[PDB]
Symmetry: D2
Subunit: 236 residues, 4 copies
């Protein structure tokens, strides 16, 4: 199957697959059953920001999600990613809805990865930023229901005339493979930021957004809708 | 055919296609017959650096090539690239040899492109750096004879046991399409740097190296070896 | 006196010192009497963006100022800055009001300077970004009436209870001297962006905002209020 | 006194102040008696690289020091720096010799600091790189014996006709204060890299190099030579 590392912004508690009984941010290593979670209160209709970082010396994957006005939730997990991920990966954003629904709108996304050696100059590095998305982006792979709208936003799941739809799944991956580690590298690091808008006319919302790193040929698994966030074929 | 903008480092004068009678750097817009050239004295066996820049407000494409110890050659040409290039391009390095030959070795390559709007934050941007090349690079498209060697260098044309070979052509393109202009952008700019080593056991060398920007599906044209630098099918 | 290179956003025509009879953007080299201008229509109360760039190979200083919704004005001037500016400079923003007045509010400011040599790695470089300004910024030199407000904006000229005041002048300089050229550099370049809000309850407004580069010990000249934008002691 | 956080490259074991009995890298929080150390074998006469990173979500300060050819040593320490350091700091490099001596030569130094908020755009950020040092650097504060030489290197301690001298101490601080945290910031991070050459004609060498972060008005304490690395007035 795919090899997935993800940070989920999980807006609906599914306690049979080990979610806590509240909305949460989580770090997922090869499974939907998060290795670490923290309570996170979703603000329906407000723009939030997530920042994710990792460095191979520290071996600590951390994420923080915040809204304007002081509310922030952080989660970290110690793991050596060189022994989880393959050498070449693609990075992406995924989201889903199920019975309950929400917009999963991405307003901006930046990512940096560096492979360092014996110099201030990196052996290899990549940095991209999108603060607006093109109508027909040649540098993104859009999967499932993902599309860009006339406002320049990335809509990971279906929205019709301003209302989000049930049972939708979509992902966007950056087109270039990322060289996330190398046997000569002394340090490898990456940092990602994205801003998002989760909104729904309903009080009950689902299912969430995830930032993920996968094998380069990753596609949406069959049966990964709803609680599996378009990332996993099952809940093991 | 392809749409090509290139900066050539031309090591062999072919005066029937309009080269000056000396080695030179040139700016090529859709033709091998450079729109602007400057004399450039190749230092066989030394590492040189090229820096190339363009900004859509200034509308001036400039290049400088230098060797350690003070020797530098610059060339510029005023042109509106929005009316030459398509919206999406790939960027790359090309080189060739013919009857005369040289190594066309690339030691490092960096590129930045930005599309700016009404903020310090770019609408879109891309930056990559390679100070070493991987043995099997998933983020480069290698065409023709191009390969990476065990030292981590990019060899655009064939070298066997340390000697360069005649009648070789090769190119390397960065894998991701680059969004080089957009109808909403207020400014688009790009900057590229690469370092190279042209060496040959012979006093007479050929044919040169070019940095180029092309339509995304660009491939080596038939008959583009030698003086056409792997860029053009003919000398019109 | 000081040595000043500036890009002015001039909101009030003073035709006795050679302004055109309309609002304009201008490039100023050691004098208020701009070497190049372009018509610019100020949108009272809207946030605008300016982008300024220079590269020592191209020898073209360019600026563009734009507002959301497609309105943009550009100006360029060819000049070798190595023969105008000293080796070490400070960079800054200046503004003034006179009989007529406006807010001269800076919302964000970014600057990059690079001195390049024979590598992808710069010999020296500096990049700073402010998207918010601190209440007591230790990394800015504030001169005259300049202050930061409780919203995190930089107010270059006096505002009292939301109204701008007449006969005010203020500047902000970045604290570190910038090494803008070096006798070993093959290329020197800089790029600056800032966003601003010029607003006034009056239909008639003055005097403008300038981005400037000066000798490191530059201070506001006596008598530089109003039309001289806090940059020059006289109109020669 | 000063408030110092430092990463030491300690080339001489002083076991009365708690050094291990071997050369080591260490993380120092307000004291020379390192909170964490790792064995590090100095290669006399070879160029090494150090990389240091911290992020306020992860709260893990990490350092790695490496030489070409695969030899690397890493150390990390978990600490909340917001509760150690003041809001504004200067960053710097320090070194010393005592009875035993070595060159403490810095060949390059890069530093980045970011204060992040609710956007891909940083609230504030600073990045500088030096791959060569100017003869009279206006953007560094040189303290004690520190000087730049005709090769463009930074010599933190005295060298005469290619030989290092005993009982020398010197530091270099970047001129601009760095805004290392802010009460509105969601994340603060910094990353530093430098390359160095420790060489001596003697088999026994001392005392080491440190990267440090201090209160902005930090000066070399009296009696901080030798084992105290120019950082502390005593060994408490
Ligand atoms: C009732 O279950 C359905 O709806 C929820 C909420 O959307 C999803 O988590 C789940 O996978 C199913 O699709
Ligand atoms: C003699 O002509 C051949 O060799 C030169 C030098 O290599 C090339 O420029 C040319 O295209 C031919 O291949
Ligand atoms: C009437 O002249 C005054 O007001 C204008 C507009 O503010 C300024 O340009 C000028 O320098 C004087 O201060
Ligand atoms: C013998 O002690 C002296 O020399 C060593 C080695 O240089 C230093 O660590 C110490 O502080 C003293 O200066
Ligand atoms: Ca869930
Ligand atoms: Ca030729
Ligand atoms: Ca005027
Ligand atoms: Ca010691
Ligand atoms: Mn969950
Ligand atoms: Mn030619
Ligand atoms: Mn004017
Ligand atoms: Mn020690």
């Amino acid at each position: 199957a795919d090899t997935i590392v993800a940070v989920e912004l999980d807006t609906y508690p599914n306690t049979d697959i080990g979610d806590p009984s509240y909305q949460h941010i989580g770090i997922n290593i090869k499974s939907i059953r998060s290795k670490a979670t923290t309570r996170w209160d979703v603000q329906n209709g407000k723009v939030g920001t997530a920042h994710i970082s990792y460095n191979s010396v520290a071996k600590r994957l951390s994420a923080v999600v915040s809204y304007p006005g002081g509310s922030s939730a952080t989660v970290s997990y110690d793991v050596d990613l060189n022994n989880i991920l393959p050498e070449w990966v693609r990075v992406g954003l995924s989201a889903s809805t199920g019975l309950y629904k929400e917009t999963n709108t991405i307003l901006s996304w930046s990512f940096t990865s560096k492979l360092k050696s014996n110099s201030t100059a990196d052996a290899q590095s990549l940095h991209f930023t999108f603060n607006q998305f093109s109508q027909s982006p040649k540098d993104l792979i859009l999967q499932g229901d993902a599309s860009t709208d006339s406002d320049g936003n990335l809509q990971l799941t279906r929205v019709s005339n301003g209302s989000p739809q049930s049972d939708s799944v979509g992902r966007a991956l950056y087109y270039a493979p990322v060289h996330i580690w190398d046997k000569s590298a002394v340090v490898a690091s990456f940092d990602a930021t994205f801003t998002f808008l989760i909104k729904s006319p309903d009080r009950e919302i689902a299912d969430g957004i995830a930032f993920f790193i996968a094998n380069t040929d990753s596609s949406i698994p069959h049966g990964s809708g709803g609680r599996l966030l378009g990332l996993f074929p099952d809940a093991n």
